[PDB]
């Protein structure tokens, strides 16, 4: 079934691979070559998850956990039950994520729109590969990657962070958090501003974008603009994820101590490094 | 059954209702779903259609009620390529001229958008007292080049969003003296030229024209922008 | 292939003094300078700003909060500017010790000053809240902004006011300090048995991640259809154009469902407020109802 306005857009073309061979829809979903690829990787990865559950001895989704190989395996392959399933599932997950992105691109082309969406999605993919591929490889073992389990992968975050004291002191970690908080702040304000204009007080006509601008100049003396706020939100969310991957690719690779020790270059500058008094004096 | 357990169970209930509400609110346009022949589809999904709401539009422009009887209000030059559902519909003629596919446009009101005071939101800079180029390259006077590396015309003016203080169109004078508008988001201002990758130099004349030299309607904007974006798919044969 | 991340040609005109509606034009400042710098990414116009009694009160009250923390930092630094800059991030104005309970009689240097700063901060935030309401009201707009702001105030009220009272001690509040309040956050989790196993904490994280997810989607979506004037969202609501149709169809073809130009902003406002809404709940139950979220978790 279609939306009332959808048919005129359902023309052939825009594919990157296969021509018209996979140029069709299943219900609302557009297929395309990378739609078939996504299904192939996704189905194959899910089977291996169910298989790992059988080896594990449980069907409770809260307990299933696919662990990577032990550190002793280094970067080599492992048997299925001893980290091999994690290795294969990681390949399938990557295949699905990348296929998904290239499918979005095919859809951008058929709709004659820009490619901002798959471009932004690639940052999330990059953060995933930072944690399962780039950082493990640079550290020399797949075991440094995180396990595929609802709860075990939270334990991984907690164990990995406390290996370096309080991870809060990771300076890139601070920046990434700042973009995460600022983004949610910007998202709330933007949604509220449009709704406040499209849904004014009772007994009022719909407001205009000028009202949106005036509201924010009145409030904080500046309005970024209707185009600028969408540029900004895209920026805040991608920068947040960019400094996330950055704050981890350096942990365990070029920095090994407690992240609080990183702030000593400021404290121990040989001129005020000894002035008595204060906290560090 | 401690207070924490009840809090989290309550929240999951509240969240399910919230999602149901959000989804129905997002069915105020494009629903009910249609078959590929325009009739109503048997399976509409589990979420019902929301009840009508009314916006009172400013400047005496009337009221909009959504949901309401939908209508393209224009002919669609396409045809089925399969008896079964889910397959592309092929253009029956020239898709750029017939405004289908990536060249689609919507039958919006044949009026210009207005600012908060009731004046035209978009104006040519020659009619916008005080406006000027403040940074970047001024494209006025520059030649406009198509994807065939041929020159189609030259920039003669900039159409400005006055409330936002933002360039939205280039007015390009064609070899025959007439002008066309070009979306600012589809052009590439360089040092010595303006380059448009979406159209070939001989497709500029096909851009829809406006009926007034000092204002553009929402319908005209949709026809212009749709045509230019459609060139990405439909003008590629002569794209170097 | 232009991407529309930065403006190509800035244009500038007579400053926009804004809508009037029922705003008291006496309290609007003059217009400030235009910023070419900001013009590349957004609007270049600075000002005017509205400055009423709430704004002035919020401003002055907020600066008193600031100066109170400031003098305490200069006092910890022994008034030495060198020591001040060095240990700036390590200074901390801490609440009264548990001994004082909820008493206001803590001497200045043992939590008395933290109480004075919190008072100023309390006045500044709430008067600013009233400001977001009256600014919308003066223009005849909905109060969505003031309600979304409440969600943030909720978590802040819980962290510094509501929870410490239910615990019966101001010492349970957060200290004023760059590093000290990071440390407070770490201890809060260890004391209460790992917040990873607080369900409202996990929810709060889903919505924080989901806010970045949704804004990357929406921001990227609007820029991809800005070639059809998509960022003019209020008129797309009143008169659906091809921008709204292509945006909806991209997501329908991608993941099977879609929003409308208005409805995507209800997703957004809720995605964001649910961060601090769920988080404030989770913090309020920590120590009052549940002592060990991991242990509590293993029974449910
Ligand atoms: C939520 C759990 C913790 C907490 C944990 C963290 C962590 C973890 C980090 C911060 C960071 C910051 N926090 Mg803190 N923070 C909390 C409560 C607060 C409160 C408050 C009103 O209670 C304030 C004013 C701040 C203020 C700040 C800034 C110094 C900084 C960036 C904020 C930001 O993105 O703002 C957006 C607003 C504008 C741009 C305006 N935090 C609570 C107590 N906060 C980050 C930082 O850089 O710390 C050094 C950081 O890494
Ligand atoms: C005790 C634990 C430690 C700690 C240790 C760590 C560690 C260790 C790490 C972080 C990382 C992060 N931490 Mg920290 N951190 C702590 C305290 C905090 C606090 C806080 C208030 O106290 C905050 C706000 C943060 C904030 C953050 C972020 C900056 C970052 C996570 C986002 C990210 O990378 O996304 C990136 C996004 C993704 C990975 C998602 C990718 C999605 C893929 C592409 C698609 C999936 C598709 C899916 C399977 C399909 C399902 C389909 C169905 C239809 C549903 N931390 C404490 C001090 N933190 C992480 C980081 O930076 O990672 C790079 C990280 O590894
Ligand atoms: C980002 C830095 C850390 C990390 C730190 C944390 C912390 C800390 C928390 C989570 C939480 C969650 N994480 Mg994790 N997480 C990471 C990497 C991942 C990846 C991945 C493929 O890289 C995935 C799929 C998940 C998935 C999840 C969910 C189980 C949960 C809510 C996420 C959410 O709503 O996000 C925002 C996205 C959306 C709102 C969109 C919808 C996404 C849905 C919910 C995804 C479901 C995935 C499904 C359970 C797994 C795949 C199913 C396949 C069919 C096999 N995490 C890395 C290692 N994650 C929280 C939790 O409660 O966990 C129990 C939590 O507290
Ligand atoms: C060791 C650390 C602990 C832990 C301890 C805590 C604690 C403690 C808290 C959080 C909280 C949060 N944590 Mg945790 N957290 C951990 C691990 C993580 C991880 C991770 C990757 O593992 C992530 C992603 C997170 C993420 C998060 C967020 C989802 C949440 C904060 C919401 C927010 O927006 O606050 C930011 C918003 C505010 C503080 C509201 C502020 C609003 C006020 C009114 C504004 C003040 C303005 C002021 C005047 C400044 C003016 C500036 C002007 C420019 C002048 N945590 C570990 C396990 N986390 C909070 C929560 O809700 O938990 C359930 C919380 O309190
Ligand atoms: C970079 C900015 C933010 C962002 C952006 C973003 N995400 C995106 C997009 C964008 C712009 C899309 O276009 C795309 C989309 O279509 O979203 C609706 C997407 C997407 N972001 C998603 C999730 C997601 N994004 C996240 C984060 C972020 N996304 C960033 C914060 C997170 C988290 C944890 O924060 C999650 C969970 C999906 C909903 C979707 C991509 C779906 C996809 O790739 O589908 C193909 C794959 C499948 C259908 C299933 C594959 C199954 C695997 C083979 C097996 C599972 C293995 C896995 C490793 C198990 C892990 C489980 C444990 C960790 C619990
Ligand atoms: C929905 C939850 C998110 C959120 C929303 C939010 N914040 C808000 C608002 C909203 C809806 C406002 O209307 C208000 C504002 O005017 O912003 C421009 C504000 C605000 N959020 C602010 C800060 C802030 N918000 C934060 C967080 C969040 N705000 C959440 C992530 C944080 C942190 C630590 O993450 C900070 C530091 C201020 C910029 C502003 C409140 C101004 C104020 O009270 O000033 C008084 C003091 C002086 C003037 C000095
Ligand atoms: C202004 O313009 C905009 C719109 O239009 C007006 C929008 O519509 C949207 C979309 C946003 C929403 C609808 C809001 C809700 C989304 C959320 C909360 C994000 C989180 C999303 C989800 C949890 C959903 C995830 C779903 C999936 C990943 C789909 C599941 C995948 C399946 C079933 C398989 C895919 C199918 C194939 C590969 C083809 C079939 C294969 C064969 C072999 C036949 C945005 C951003 C926007 O700006
Ligand atoms: C040149 O230097 C000078 C001196 C001029 C300066 O100005 C230097 C000053 C600075 C550098 C300022 C530095 C500022 C900070 C470090 C601020 C850091 C703040 C945080 C990390 C956030 C902490 C906020 C959390 C809390 C606990 C907030 C309390 C809010 C409560 C809701 C209020 C509760 C009220 C109470 C207890 C009583 C008051 C009255 C009531 C009616 C409730
Ligand atoms: C730049 C000089 C002045 C200082 C500025 C004060 C500091 C504001 C801080 C954070 C909020 C970020 C605001 C971004 C959210 C805007 C919401 C929105 O939708 O705005 C679009 C547009 O303004 C409507 O037409
Ligand atoms: C789609 C291909 C991209 C590769 C990314 C997948 C990395 C998974 C980890 C490697 C496992 C393979 N092996 C046997 C060498 O360990
Ligand atoms: C890591 C996965 C990569 C797949 C997603 C990449 C999509 C980028 C978008 C294409 C950019 C094309 N363009 C318009 C810049 O020429
Ligand atoms: C026993 C009940 C305990 C409280 C449970 C809280 C769940 C509801 C949270 C949503 C609050 C409603 N609101 C204010 C956002 O509209
Ligand atoms: C606590 C139990 C709640 C069950 C159902 C809750 C549905 C609420 C959904 C929010 C609706 C938003 N609205 C209509 C108030 O704007
Ligand atoms: C992250 C939460 C997402 C909730 C998604 C619920 C909405 C699905 C609606 C599908 C039905 C719509 N349809 C196919 C009839 O158009
Ligand atoms: C505690 C946070 C509450 C969630 C806010 C969601 C916004 C919905 C409220 C609409 C406001 C209606 N009105 C009449 C005041 O304009
Ligand atoms: C407004 C859209 C809301 C999307 C819903 C997101 C649900 C994420 C599920 C997280 C599970 C957290 N929990 C309860 C297991 O701790
Ligand atoms: C936990 C998040 C769940 C998201 C699942 C969304 C499913 C896509 C919408 C399905 C609509 C298609 N259909 C065939 C039912 O009409
Ligand atoms: Cl005021
Ligand atoms: Fe928007």
GROMACS .gro file of C-alpha atoms in nm, chain A residues 120-271:
model
  152
  120UNK     CA    1   2.549   1.076   0.899
  121UNK     CA    2   2.475   0.707   0.956
  122UNK     CA    3   2.837   0.630   0.861
  123UNK     CA    4   2.953   0.808   1.178
  124UNK     CA    5   2.759   0.558   1.389
  125UNK     CA    6   2.914   0.277   1.184
  126UNK     CA    7   3.256   0.431   1.244
  127UNK     CA    8   3.199   0.431   1.621
  128UNK     CA    9   3.102   0.063   1.606
  129UNK     CA   10   3.415  -0.029   1.409
  130UNK     CA   11   3.623   0.178   1.651
  131UNK     CA   12   3.519  -0.052   1.936
  132UNK     CA   13   3.520  -0.392   1.761
  133UNK     CA   14   3.789  -0.348   1.493
  134UNK     CA   15   4.023  -0.048   1.510
  135UNK     CA   16   4.090  -0.046   1.885
  136UNK     CA   17   4.119  -0.426   1.929
  137UNK     CA   18   4.359  -0.447   1.633
  138UNK     CA   19   4.578  -0.163   1.761
  139UNK     CA   20   4.583  -0.336   2.102
  140UNK     CA   21   4.659  -0.675   1.946
  141UNK     CA   22   4.361  -0.890   2.042
  142UNK     CA   23   3.993  -0.929   1.957
  143UNK     CA   24   3.925  -0.988   2.326
  144UNK     CA   25   3.951  -0.613   2.385
  145UNK     CA   26   3.628  -0.577   2.186
  146UNK     CA   27   3.292  -0.579   2.366
  147UNK     CA   28   3.061  -0.880   2.406
  148UNK     CA   29   2.726  -0.906   2.231
  149UNK     CA   30   2.490  -0.927   2.526
  150UNK     CA   31   2.226  -0.693   2.662
  151UNK     CA   32   2.384  -0.679   3.008
  152UNK     CA   33   2.735  -0.819   2.958
  153UNK     CA   34   2.813  -0.531   2.721
  154UNK     CA   35   2.729  -0.284   2.998
  155UNK     CA   36   2.971  -0.469   3.228
  156UNK     CA   37   3.232  -0.429   2.952
  157UNK     CA   38   3.189  -0.051   2.957
  158UNK     CA   39   3.223  -0.050   3.336
  159UNK     CA   40   3.529  -0.277   3.338
  160UNK     CA   41   3.700  -0.092   3.053
  161UNK     CA   42   3.641   0.250   3.208
  162UNK     CA   43   3.759   0.159   3.558
  163UNK     CA   44   4.077   0.011   3.411
  164UNK     CA   45   4.176   0.379   3.373
  165UNK     CA   46   4.037   0.510   3.701
  166UNK     CA   47   3.742   0.744   3.654
  167UNK     CA   48   3.688   0.762   3.278
  168UNK     CA   49   3.526   1.104   3.333
  169UNK     CA   50   3.876   1.254   3.326
  170UNK     CA   51   3.937   1.139   2.968
  171UNK     CA   52   3.943   1.486   2.805
  172UNK     CA   53   3.795   1.366   2.476
  173UNK     CA   54   3.528   1.186   2.681
  174UNK     CA   55   3.428   1.520   2.834
  175UNK     CA   56   3.395   1.683   2.491
  176UNK     CA   57   3.183   1.397   2.357
  177UNK     CA   58   2.950   1.423   2.658
  178UNK     CA   59   2.920   1.799   2.609
  179UNK     CA   60   2.799   1.744   2.253
  180UNK     CA   61   2.557   1.475   2.370
  181UNK     CA   62   2.403   1.702   2.636
  182UNK     CA   63   2.402   2.007   2.409
  183UNK     CA   64   2.237   1.803   2.133
  184UNK     CA   65   1.947   1.687   2.350
  185UNK     CA   66   1.919   2.049   2.464
  186UNK     CA   67   1.901   2.167   2.103
  187UNK     CA   68   1.660   1.889   1.999
  188UNK     CA   69   1.416   1.975   2.279
  189UNK     CA   70   1.425   2.347   2.198
  190UNK     CA   71   1.380   2.292   1.824
  191UNK     CA   72   1.085   2.056   1.858
  192UNK     CA   73   0.923   2.287   2.112
  193UNK     CA   74   0.973   2.597   1.897
  194UNK     CA   75   0.805   2.454   1.586
  195UNK     CA   76   0.517   2.309   1.788
  196UNK     CA   77   0.474   2.637   1.976
  197UNK     CA   78   0.434   2.816   1.641
  198UNK     CA   79   0.218   2.557   1.464
  199UNK     CA   80   0.003   2.522   1.778
  200UNK     CA   81  -0.029   2.872   1.928
  201UNK     CA   82  -0.253   2.988   2.211
  202UNK     CA   83  -0.623   2.916   2.178
  203UNK     CA   84  -0.801   3.183   1.978
  204UNK     CA   85  -0.487   3.253   1.773
  205UNK     CA   86  -0.387   3.207   1.413
  206UNK     CA   87  -0.092   2.983   1.332
  207UNK     CA   88   0.233   3.168   1.396
  208UNK     CA   89   0.502   3.236   1.135
  209UNK     CA   90   0.876   3.162   1.133
  210UNK     CA   91   0.931   3.531   1.214
  211UNK     CA   92   0.764   3.459   1.549
  212UNK     CA   93   1.012   3.174   1.603
  213UNK     CA   94   1.300   3.413   1.536
  214UNK     CA   95   1.156   3.685   1.759
  215UNK     CA   96   1.091   3.438   2.041
  216UNK     CA   97   1.459   3.342   2.056
  217UNK     CA   98   1.598   3.692   2.015
  218UNK     CA   99   1.370   3.796   2.302
  219UNK     CA  100   1.488   3.497   2.505
  220UNK     CA  101   1.866   3.494   2.447
  221UNK     CA  102   1.925   3.773   2.197
  222UNK     CA  103   2.009   3.551   1.899
  223UNK     CA  104   1.831   3.323   1.651
  224UNK     CA  105   2.033   3.078   1.445
  225UNK     CA  106   1.763   3.041   1.178
  226UNK     CA  107   1.548   2.763   1.037
  227UNK     CA  108   1.830   2.628   0.819
  228UNK     CA  109   2.099   2.682   1.083
  229UNK     CA  110   1.930   2.476   1.354
  230UNK     CA  111   1.918   2.170   1.127
  231UNK     CA  112   2.283   2.220   1.036
  232UNK     CA  113   2.353   2.255   1.408
  233UNK     CA  114   2.167   1.942   1.517
  234UNK     CA  115   2.339   1.733   1.252
  235UNK     CA  116   2.667   1.883   1.372
  236UNK     CA  117   2.610   1.833   1.744
  237UNK     CA  118   2.515   1.467   1.704
  238UNK     CA  119   2.798   1.379   1.464
  239UNK     CA  120   3.057   1.566   1.671
  240UNK     CA  121   2.933   1.383   1.981
  241UNK     CA  122   2.990   1.046   1.813
  242UNK     CA  123   3.316   1.159   1.653
  243UNK     CA  124   3.473   1.249   1.988
  244UNK     CA  125   3.331   0.925   2.129
  245UNK     CA  126   3.531   0.716   1.883
  246UNK     CA  127   3.823   0.950   1.949
  247UNK     CA  128   3.810   0.910   2.327
  248UNK     CA  129   3.836   0.530   2.288
  249UNK     CA  130   4.084   0.486   2.003
  250UNK     CA  131   4.341   0.662   2.224
  251UNK     CA  132   4.259   0.461   2.538
  252UNK     CA  133   4.487   0.160   2.575
  253UNK     CA  134   4.684   0.253   2.262
  254UNK     CA  135   4.867   0.583   2.327
  255UNK     CA  136   4.743   0.632   2.687
  256UNK     CA  137   4.768   0.362   2.954
  257UNK     CA  138   4.752   0.534   3.295
  258UNK     CA  139   4.463   0.684   3.491
  259UNK     CA  140   4.299   0.967   3.300
  260UNK     CA  141   4.326   1.194   3.604
  261UNK     CA  142   4.705   1.180   3.560
  262UNK     CA  143   4.662   1.344   3.218
  263UNK     CA  144   4.567   1.674   3.386
  264UNK     CA  145   4.902   1.696   3.567
  265UNK     CA  146   5.075   1.885   3.285
  266UNK     CA  147   4.855   2.176   3.393
  267UNK     CA  148   4.905   2.134   3.768
  268UNK     CA  149   5.280   2.069   3.764
  269UNK     CA  150   5.398   2.347   3.534
  270UNK     CA  151   5.739   2.417   3.697
  271UNK     CA  152   5.655   2.781   3.783
   0.00000   0.00000   0.00000
